[PDB]
Design an enzyme around this catalytic site. Structure first.
Site, PDB file in Angstrom:
ATOM      1  N   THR A   1      16.745   9.276  18.342  1.00 18.32           N
ATOM      2  CA  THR A   1      16.974   9.160  16.913  1.00 18.32           C
ATOM      3  C   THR A   1      15.681   9.335  16.143  1.00 18.32           C
ATOM      4  O   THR A   1      14.731   8.580  16.332  1.00 18.32           O
ATOM      5  CB  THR A   1      17.561   7.783  16.559  1.00 18.32           C
ATOM      6  OG1 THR A   1      18.825   7.610  17.211  1.00 18.32           O
ATOM      7  CG2 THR A   1      17.731   7.639  15.054  1.00 18.32           C
ATOM      8  N   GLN A   2      15.634  10.345  15.279  1.00 19.38           N
ATOM      9  CA  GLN A   2      14.423  10.537  14.501  1.00 19.38           C
ATOM     10  C   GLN A   2      14.376   9.585  13.318  1.00 19.38           C
ATOM     11  O   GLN A   2      13.368   8.911  13.087  1.00 19.38           O
ATOM     12  CB  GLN A   2      14.338  11.980  14.025  1.00 19.38           C
ATOM     13  CG  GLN A   2      14.207  12.940  15.170  1.00 19.38           C
ATOM     14  CD  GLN A   2      12.936  12.721  15.942  1.00 19.38           C
ATOM     15  OE1 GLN A   2      12.967  12.246  17.077  1.00 19.38           O
ATOM     16  NE2 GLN A   2      11.804  13.053  15.333  1.00 19.38           N
ATOM     17  N   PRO A 105      14.260   9.239  21.033  1.00 16.30           N
ATOM     18  CA  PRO A 105      14.259   7.809  21.325  1.00 16.30           C
ATOM     19  C   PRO A 105      15.515   7.171  20.768  1.00 16.30           C
ATOM     20  O   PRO A 105      16.103   7.642  19.796  1.00 16.30           O
ATOM     21  CB  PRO A 105      13.014   7.305  20.590  1.00 16.30           C
ATOM     22  CG  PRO A 105      12.870   8.247  19.448  1.00 16.30           C
ATOM     23  CD  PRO A 105      13.340   9.586  19.938  1.00 16.30           C
TER      24      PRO A 105
END
Lengths: 215, 191, 220, 204, 199, 201, 213, 191, 215, 199
Positions: A1-2, A105
């Protein structure tokens, strides 16, 4: 996940004599808008361990799904063998590390609490895979705010009773209600013993504002 | 833009504006912002348009195929799960404000919300859209537990009225949707 | 750096921690963060050290000038107005995280100043890097109109928690108490951390170093 | 950094009744040295020196500026200067360039003009004073000299062990350092006399 | 770009610049002169941004001549060096900085010979031999191999002959001719212009 | 960082320092830079420790494979070619490597210079590193082909002394290897300060 | 945005003796301006003659430890014998280069006995070089610790000071002094000390506290 | 944060939360967000804090000096003009959400609004603050022309209650101010 | 002004036989939030000329102040001489150009309409100083939308009557209400003749939505 | 940067590169060879990124030798030129491009001598005389004043002598020695190594 869309906030957990208490609140704020003010942020894993998390709520739903499927699978093995909470901790650490190694991540901050075979367990899992054991955990701003109360009383007294631990958690959640902007006066306490896993209801806090009558 | 779904005892009630805009120019003045999927389940969308249209078409595909293979009417939570899976697995490129509602024989009327992230939750009322914040301001003021159908229609009517009146992107014309055990009753208000 | 302020039943008890780090290395073990302003008003600083120092010396000079010009005891609100006007005049370029405290004719008055120029009057403030732990101890165990030893124990507890959390100080927490009549200032209040004794004599000898060129210069 | 443009290391160490100041000798651009006799410890009156480290431009400029103000003070007032006074003067001179800052870390080490009391202090690049009791250091290498002096210092020191302690500290911390080396000069001063010795450091 | 060498002796200073005034592809002028006679026993060399070189020569050369006409006598090399350093340090912190690389060569009646060394950041130096450029690298290894403080001037000329002959061996630029000065108890004496046929 | 190499009538001289810094901080003083590839090859370390170490170790592996398959010892140019071919496949990905390859051949002396930029070249004199230019200067003073043994030893030793004296990123023990017709032989490992006392006068 | 690394800090020491290899490390794990714990030992007991310490990024330390343990068991279950020390050093170097283009941010020190029964400290770098040295200090307090060991272990920069072989308890008081003296000035050092001693009879451990800030 | 001003027939009624925050940490739990200038005129602020404090002090300076020289009680529109000039002159550096209200003998109770730009307008009601969008959602729903004092107090109580409940920055405790011909009546409520 | 906070929207103006009609709406939107839905965006200058503007409303208040002061000054000269509208147009152009020369532009888009001495006048002033005369002006998106209706009828018929002009303005504002996002169904019409300057009240539009019953 | 001339004659081709293998400060090698004998009547030159030069030389040289062993006979210069251009045009639009600057020199039994001209953007050219670098700039003008299509080889050598003598007069790099080939009805004949003592 940005980019984390819908974040939770701080999770508190501390051992005591033969059990672990975990409490986190029930707020799903987006940015500054507290958009989802009735959500559950603690999964009661099978009979021993118990999970609470922060960060992206969608990722927590995802890991909830995966852990549920794995727990169902071992319980359908029918062998009489279960997962220790430390095994769950190891698996989750490897999962987070393999997430961030692929540069995708899982934006979370997870706390694993368990009591199995006489021994309590309280593990920590970061987004980056940073993972350790501690007699008292505090995530997000809780490591800045409610951590020194834990470290004060545990230095003053290394073991606890269930009532003292629960009261201390109540006080810390009161403090977090005082000065976290992303906080809400509705939280749930979750507790593991040898008697099973129990999730208490959406408790609240009792606040004071008598300093406001000063200028 | 501003979309809304409210359940009641018998069923659910939906609603949307129209006004598909691009920048500051209106490209389209009237829009079916809410979309049929099954004969008893709707969804209303926001964010980008093409994204939600393609996702809704694929959900229609998979859900119709699954519910024909069951030879039973589908669940609502199932369709919510489909939007959850397609949103979460392939987030990163989409902007979806998908809100799922619909009556069910087993579970009555249900309302699910899927915001831009990909989380899934069941709610009793929902907002959605960029101009949804304001009626999100007072939807927790005006709500009363246990409305009727007409109270929900008047409620959402006043809601979308004030949302269309205040927000610049919202406006256009009012579309409503009433879903129950009996039938699907849609209507369009104007003025 | 964790400074705090509080108002008990008569005055103000201030505390500080004196680890002046420059980056990542402990550069100091004793740095006076409690500064002089007037016979009744004191101040604590945080953030950029020399900015707080030069500013607090300038404002203390100006208030000494004004007080000697007037002929009576200074007021805290004048110090507050000068500080906020100066820090707003620098447009937030100067980083000076200040705690302002004094006892006037009206009584005790505590101000915290954020370095752009936003100020607040509060019964209790915490400032600095580890201010959060001291604010935890304050929000847990504050009650209105405390007594003297109660307030001293509370402020000591708060700065002690800031020291057991990160970037506190090795130092022996400094305290300062302002009343209507009695001003006190206590540097070595409580030393919790004794240094461990050395285990070997790693003392050099009289000739273990090669010398190339000597010089002797006598004096008077 | 900009502080690591020309290298540099200044150590000052307080003894029992005396004080010792030492510095390195190397001068050069980032990786190319030039000379081994660049002066960084200047006399400011009797039994009181100052050391300057960092960019050499501000070293020579601030040393000449400070000598300017120092002689104006010592001619308007016949006495010689107390060390706190010198500290305040250097702090004011550096703080006048608050946003145009010099790149230097001055270290003052001197004795008392009335008594034999030693004095050490150090300042930052904007004028933050710091008086201590054991030692102060400056320059590019810091952690080396902190570890060495926190390893070797004793409170009450005869000048010989003072000299040998500061000698081993400077030698070892310089040999670990890269950009600052090529000899060490040591000033060990006291009430009676002033001693300046140069050590056989590694020219590598 | 290039380098002008500055060898100090017991009672002389051996300075030698080049004669190149090239611009980035072509060599426009092959007899350029960077040698600036300040006084009867004080030389100055300069390399840098070539619009600043000329303005330094005007300012320094003419202000030292102004001192000479004012008072009655020649400066020491030390005060002249410090005056150049001061004007660099003043011109640095402005909207108009100068980017030059100097070195100073003087001769006192009392101090004897003296060699100084600037930089584009206004640093004084009292050097046995100075360097700038890439020839800095090459000439300082060779020169620091073969130095004696009590060296005669013809040994220094032979060493400089050898050093240039090893400059024309692994250098990328051209540098065909170097002009060479010397300073003595008399004054500035120009030695012959030093070029080599290479191959 | 300063390495050099030059071949002459009686084989090849290779010398190096042993300082390997990290930014402004010196890690060690005794970093053995001249990587002993074979009993007949010597490789160097020129920019980066891990890259030089890895690729020369892999090259030693490959050379041993070649000999054990053909019962005939590899040449020098072939080894340099294999090294350049293996290095070229990561061009632009950020490898710093400027090593040298020395050895004795069927042709006799062999001296090559292989870069991470892939500048595989022959030659007679070389010097790599930050302070390599200093070695070029004093070496091209003292260089000939008809030199003696102790003369070449003194040349290399003086060269590394001047290089480490001027450069800041160089120092430590001066290694000194000598390539013969049969195999290479370590001459000595001399400290800087000992050479400073010996050669200062 | 997401940054893949974070600085956890830490301090690892090693001393190679005549017949012993002492590796010690504090057990503080911190991040930025917080304390995560006061018990996290950097030391790991691999074999009966090998102790590894790992500082830097913590997740990579844990991952690297587990991979090294796996390959140790693979070598044992393939070749009927334990590894030496230098083989483990070589293997770790191969691993650290095998993730060259996305590096581990980990300093590593392996202490242990060689096949002669002598002490051997193999230092490392984040990218995969190694060498057999007598003492290393890795982590945040490297520069606070190398010159004092240069003074004491190496006997450097001294005159007329003979070379005594480093005994055991001399090394112990050295290690205690350097961790106290470095804990005075470091912010990333304290709260415990886990000292590992490798003899010809096993591994000993010893717990020495420090200052609590 | 969330500030509000409502006039009625006799006078005006103000209101604010407290909760001065910095990022996600609360710096101050209780704050006088509204500021006296004259004895009959208040202002309540938002945006940055130091900007509004310095501007309010300078306005207090100029208005007090001017009103002493007139030897008459000042106007509200005068103070609004002063805020307009000082806001507009440094719109490049200030972030002011200044809302001027106050009773006047000549003109009764008035409410003026000056947002971050520097424009000046007279309104019958005003919102302000980052968490004001929501009660701006329904302030055009609940408002009725011609309220009393108690209706305005209950109105702003419900307003600031819902704004404090929903917005993260808003919260704390409710401070009120009632300005009329008679006096200024401040109180601190919660509920 | 570098960043416009509170913008207006499009302004329409067109000459007719012995007069100029100008109409603009009454909306003060900030971003997309229509924050100030009852404001005046036309200054009625003394007796002949008349101003309407777009862009930042605060700058419009500023120019209202300055122009009001200038008109008051000439009327206090007592000479019987006024400003021609073309002089005002010239002054405003010079003002904007000298404003933008200092790299601090006034974010506006202004329209000057006037009728003096038998002849009508309709001038344009841009932010950049671009200024001209036209028989019909249209600002913002009006130059994209209602400009071709004006240019259609003026090509089919170059002169107009007052009723036809007002009706055409009504239709163009209806269209702008249909498809401008920054628009609002409340506008005021202002008209100049030789009889003076007149500001009409807050009119509205009559809309159609019979395409919505289609799919 | 560096230089290679490509003079075409009536029945000969006069190519001449340098022998410089410098790296960014120092001239590491002064006897470098950039001349790549493809076949018995086909030469090849190369200038560019010096890790790509050798790999292109490997590819082209060995594939042409492979063709020679396959079919039994030598390529035309034209087909070789097109094959090189084709391999540039394929290697450009990839993750691994080549940045080289070639020219090809051949000799046919029927077409006689032939000169081609590449670039780092894969352009064919049938040129009378080509060059590369910055001496390219100076020298093609110098060459273009004094060209005759029916020129004898000694006139071409003298012309190239003059062109070099004007290269050593206003150029910034060193370029001490140039090697020179020639192509005839026989094959590749190496002429003497061409260096100059300058001063």
């Amino acid at each position: 996940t940005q980019n984390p869309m819908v974040t939770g906030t701080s999770v508190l957990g501390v051992k005591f004599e033969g059990g672990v208490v975990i409490a986190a609140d029930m707020l799903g704020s987006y940015g500054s808008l507290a958009r989802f003010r009735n959500i559950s942020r603690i999964m009661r894993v099978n009979n021993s361990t118990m999970l609470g998390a922060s960060g992206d709520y969608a990722d927590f739903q995802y890991l909830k799904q995966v852990l549920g499927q794995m727990v169902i699978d071992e319980e359908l093995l029918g062998d009489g063998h279960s997962y220790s909470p430390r095994a769950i901790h190891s698996w989750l650490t490897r999962a987070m590390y393999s997430r961030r190694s692929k540069m995708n991540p899982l934006w979370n901050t997870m706390v694993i609490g368990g009591y199995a075979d006489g021994e309590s367990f309280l593990g920590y899992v970061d987004m980056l895979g940073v993972a350790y054991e501690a007699p008292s955990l505090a995530t997000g701003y809780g490591a800045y705010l409610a951590q020194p109360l834990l470290r004060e009383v545990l230095e003053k007294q290394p073991v606890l009773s269930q009532t003292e631990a629960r009261d201390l958690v109540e006080r810390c959640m009161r403090v977090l209600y005082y000065r976290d902007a992303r906080s809400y006066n509705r939280f749930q306490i979750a507790t593991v013993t040898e008697k099973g896993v129990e999730i208490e209801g959406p408790l609240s806090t009792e606040t004071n504002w008598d300093i406001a009558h000063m200028i | 833009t501003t979309i809304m779904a409210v359940q009641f005892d018998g069923g659910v009630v939906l609603g949307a504006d129209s006004r598909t805009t691009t920048g500051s120019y209106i490209a389209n003045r009237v829009t079916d912002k809410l979309t049929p999927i099954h004969d008893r389940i709707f969804c209303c969308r926001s964010g980008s348009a093409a994204d939600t249209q393609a996702v809704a078409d694929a959900v229609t595909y998979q859900l119709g195929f699954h519910s024909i293979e069951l030879n039973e009417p589908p669940l609502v939570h199932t369709a919510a799960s489909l939007f959850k899976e397609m949103c979460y697995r392939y987030r990163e490129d989409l902007m979806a404000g998908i809100i799922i509602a619909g009556w069910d024989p087993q579970e009555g009327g249900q309302v699910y919300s899927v915001p831009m992230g990909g989380m899934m939750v069941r709610q009793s009322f929902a907002i959605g859209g960029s101009g949804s914040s304001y009626i999100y301001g007072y939807v927790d003021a005006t709500y009363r537990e246990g409305m009727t159908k007409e109270e929900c229609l008047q409620f959402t009517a006043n809601a979308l009225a004030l949302a269309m009146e205040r927000d610049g992107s919202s406006g256009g014309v009012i579309r409503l949707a009433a879903i129950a055990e009996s039938g699907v009753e849609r209507q369009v208000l104007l003025g | 750096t964790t400074i705090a302020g509080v108002v008990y039943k008569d005055g103000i008890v201030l505390g500080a921690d004196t680890r002046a780090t420059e980056g990542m290395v402990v550069a100091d073990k004793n740095c006076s963060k409690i500064h002089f302003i007037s016979p009744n008003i004191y101040c604590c600083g945080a953030g950029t050290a020399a900015d707080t120092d030069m500013t607090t010396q300038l404002i203390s000079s100006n208030l000494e000038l004004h007080s000697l010009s007037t002929g009576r005891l200074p007021r805290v609100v004048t110090a507050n107005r000068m500080l906020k006007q100066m820090l707003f005049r620098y447009q937030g370029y100067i980083g000076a995280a200040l705690v302002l405290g004094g006892v006037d004719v009206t009584g005790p008055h505590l101000y915290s100043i954020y370095p752009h120029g936003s100020t607040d009057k509060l019964p209790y403030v915490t400032m600095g890097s580890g201010s959060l732990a001291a604010m935890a101890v304050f929000e847990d165990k504050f009650r209105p109109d405390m007594e003297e030893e109660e307030a001293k124990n509370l402020v000591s507890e708060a700065i002690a928690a800031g020291i057991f959390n990160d970037l506190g100080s090795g130092s022996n927490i400094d305290l300062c108490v302002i009343s209507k009549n009695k001003l006190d200032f206590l540097r070595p209040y409580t030393v919790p951390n004794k240094k461990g004794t050395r285990l070997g004599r790693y003392r050099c000898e009289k000739g273990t170093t090669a010398v190339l060129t000597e010089k002797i210069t006598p004096l008077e | 950094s900009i502080m690591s443009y020309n290298g540099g290391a200044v150590m000052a160490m307080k003894g029992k009744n005396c004080v010792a100041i030492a510095a390195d000798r190397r001068f050069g651009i980032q990786a190319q040295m030039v000379t081994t006799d660049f002066q960084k410890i200047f006399p400011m009156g009797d039994r009181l020196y100052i050391g300057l480290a960092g960019l050499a431009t501000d070293v020579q400029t601030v040393a000449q500026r400070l000598k300017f103000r120092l002689n104006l003070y010592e001619l308007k007032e016949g006495r010689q200067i107390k060390p706190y006074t010198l500290m305040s003067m250097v702090a004011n001179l550096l703080y006048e360039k608050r946003f145009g800052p010099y790149y230097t870390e001055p270290v003052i080490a001197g004795l008392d003009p009335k008594t034999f009391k030693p004095f050490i202090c150090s300042l930052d690049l904007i004028g933050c004073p710091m008086v201590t009791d054991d030692f102060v250091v400056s320059g590019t290498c810091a952690e080396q000299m902190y570890g060495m002096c926190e390893s070797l210092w004793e409170p009450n020191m005869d000048p010989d062990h003072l000299f040998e302690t500061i000698s081993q500290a400077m030698l070892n911390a310089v040999d670990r350092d890269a950009v600052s080396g090529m000899g060490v000069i040591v000033h060990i001063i006291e009430k009676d006399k002033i001693t300046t010795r140069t050590l056989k450091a590694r020219m590598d | 770009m290039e380098y002008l060498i500055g060898i100090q002796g017991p009672d002389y200073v051996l300075v030698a610049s080049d004669r190149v005034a090239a611009s980035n592809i072509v060599q426009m002028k092959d007899d350029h002169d960077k040698m600036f006679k300040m006084s009867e026993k004080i030389l100055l060399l300069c390399v840098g941004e070539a619009g600043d070189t000329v303005q330094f020569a005007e300012y320094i050369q003419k202000n030292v001549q102004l001192y000479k006409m004012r008072n009655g006598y020649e400066l020491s090399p030390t005060a002249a060096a410090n005056f150049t350093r001061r004007n660099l340090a003043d011109c640095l912190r402005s909207r108009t900085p100068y980017h030059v690389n100097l070195l100073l060569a003087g001769y006192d009646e009392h101090e004897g010979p003296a060699l100084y060394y600037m930089d584009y950041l206004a640093a004084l130096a009292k050097a046995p031999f100075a360097a700038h450029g890439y020839g800095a690298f090459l000439t300082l290894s060779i020169l620091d191999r073969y130095y004696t403080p009590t060296i005669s001037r013809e040994r220094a000329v032979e060493l400089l002959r050898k050093c240039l002959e090893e400059l024309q061996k692994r250098f990328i630029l051209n540098l065909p001719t170097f002009s060479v000065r010397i300073i003595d108890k008399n004054g500035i004496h120009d030695l012959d212009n030093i070029s080599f046929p290479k191959q | 960082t300063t390495t050099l190499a030059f071949k002459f009538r009686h084989g090849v001289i290779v010398a190096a320092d042993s300082r390997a810094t990290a930014g402004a901080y010196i890690a060690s003083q005794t970093v053995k830079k001249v990587i002993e590839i074979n009993p007949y090859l010597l490789g160097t370390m020129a920019g980066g420790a891990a890259d030089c170490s890895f690729w020369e170790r892999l090259l030693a592996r490959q050379c041993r494979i070649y000999e054990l398959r053909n019962k005939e010892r590899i040449s020098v140019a072939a080894a340099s070619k294999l090294l350049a071919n293996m290095v070229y496949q990561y061009k632009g990905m950020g490898l710093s490597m400027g090593t040298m390859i020395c050895g004795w051949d069927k042709r006799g002396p062999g001296l090559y210079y292989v870069d991470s930029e892939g500048n595989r070249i022959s030659g007679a004199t070389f010097s790599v590193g930050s302070g390599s230019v200093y070695a070029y200067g004093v070496m091209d003073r003292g260089y000939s082909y008809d030199l003696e043994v102790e003369q070449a030893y003194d040349l290399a030793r003086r060269a590394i002394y001047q290089a480490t004296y001027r450069d800041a990123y160089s120092g430590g023990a001066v290694n000194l290897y000598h390539v013969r017709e049969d195999g290479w032989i370590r001459v000595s490992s001399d400290n800087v300060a000992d050479l400073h006392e010996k050669y200062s006068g | 945005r997401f940054s893949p690394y974070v600085f956890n800090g830490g301090t690892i020491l090693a001393i190679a003796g005549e017949d012993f290899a002492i590796v010690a490390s504090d057990t503080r794990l911190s991040e930025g301006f917080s304390i995560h714990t006061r018990d996290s030992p950097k030391c790991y007991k691999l074999t009966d003659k090998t102790v590894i310490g790992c500082s830097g990024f913590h997740g990579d330390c844990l991952t690297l430890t587990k991979i090294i343990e796996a390959r140790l068991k693979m070598y044992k279950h393939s070749n009927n014998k334990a590894m030496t020390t230098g083989a483990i050093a070589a293997m770790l170097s191969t691993i650290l280069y095998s993730r060259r283009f996305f590096p581990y941010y980990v300093y590593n020190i392996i202490g242990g006995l060689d096949e002669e029964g002598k002490g051997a400290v193999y230092s490392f770098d984040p990218v995969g070089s190694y060498q057999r040295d007598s003492f290393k200090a890795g982590g945040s307090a490297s520069a606070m610790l190398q010159p004092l060991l240069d003074n004491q272990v190496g006997f450097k920069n001294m005159q007329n000071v003979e070379h005594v072989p480093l005994s055991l308890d001399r090394a112990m008081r050295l290690v205690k002094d350097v961790f106290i003296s470095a804990a005075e000035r470091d912010v990333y050092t304290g709260d415990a000390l886990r000292i590992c001693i490798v003899t010809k009879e096993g591994i000993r451990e010893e717990t020495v506290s420090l200052r609590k800030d």
